[PDB]
């Protein structure tokens, strides 16, 4: 494939501590490329990856313009939601939005998304037909009817099918040496005695991209999933990812245990033992 572009808006009210904060991040697959924070010294859409910095003033001014209008829209939306749910102006509330497009290997739109949450529950969502909405409650039904009336789905369909797909094509080309070039994990097994009778085996995958990875332990075959301590994949802080999988083994059994790594960047699946 792959491939995807996503924007994540967070609009948070903070009564008595100024106006709501608005934060927007843009991703292409597992890589952040743009950010916007209404609490910055001078609000602007800023680059987050090396391949986007090559954009011109018009791109940045244009995006900053769009984010400032969105910030205000979602400031209004917070006031609106407060009357839909009949809540006080004393409490902090949150709107989240995520939208974007997925394209196949040929660059054709596979799937578009546009979802909203209020206080962390699904609020309203664009259906895959890109023409109707699913509303989670009767308050979202009010919003739904407004968007049917305003033909919001038709405007958003055109964005997902046009601009969103066109720009992802540009981004994928401009960042092809990282976004389309896969980073295999560096791997190694460590051995730490717990007691005289037990030892931990930990399998490491470091500096890999994309984030997707499978890391399993086996004992002569087959899987030891229900006994493996697996940490959630984590960012290294340099655009790449980290993961480990641990298993507590009886002393004398360490040679029966194999680690197995699956990742797009590896041409062949890895088998590792402690040495």
């Amino acid at each position: 494939g792959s491939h995807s572009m996503r924007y994540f808006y967070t609009a948070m009210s903070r009564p008595g501590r100024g106006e709501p904060r608005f934060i927007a991040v843009g991703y292409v697959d597992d890589t952040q490329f743009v950010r916007f924070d209404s609490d910055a010294a001078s609000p602007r859409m800023a680059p987050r990856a090396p391949w986007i910095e090559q954009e011109g003033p018009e791109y940045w001014d244009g995006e900053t313009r769009n984010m400032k209008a969105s910030a205000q829209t979602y400031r209004e939306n917070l006031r609106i939601a407060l009357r839909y749910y009949n809540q006080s102006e004393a409490g902090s509330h949150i709107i989240q939005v995520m939208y974007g497009c997925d394209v196949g290997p040929d660059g054709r739109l596979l799937r578009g998304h546009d979802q909203s949450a209020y206080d962390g529950k699904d609020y309203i969502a664009l259906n895959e037909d890109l023409s109707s909405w699913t509303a989670a409650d009767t308050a979202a039904q009010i919003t739904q009817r407004k968007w049917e009336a305003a033909r919001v789905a038709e405007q958003l369909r055109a964005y997902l099918e046009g601009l969103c797909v066109e720009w992802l094509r540009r981004y994928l080309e401009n960042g092809k040496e990282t976004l389309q070039r896969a980073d295999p994990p560096k791997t190694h097994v460590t051995h730490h005695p717990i007691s005289d009778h037990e030892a931990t085996l930990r399998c490491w995958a470091l500096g890999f991209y994309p984030a997707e990875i499978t890391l399993t332990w086996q004992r002569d075959g087959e899987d030891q999933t229900q006994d493996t301590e697996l940490v959630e994949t984590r960012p290294a802080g340099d655009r790449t990812f980290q993961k480990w999988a641990a298993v507590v083994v009886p002393s004398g059994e360490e040679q029966r245990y194999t680690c197995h790594v699956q990742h797009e960047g590896l041409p062949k699946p890895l088998t590792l033992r402690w040495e």
Binding site: N66, A81, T143, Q155, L163
Partner: peptide, 9 residues
């Protein structure tokens, strides 16, 4: 590029 589509509730 973000969406220019106003989503008012």
């Amino acid at each position: 590029l973000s969406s220019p589509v106003t989503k008012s509730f």
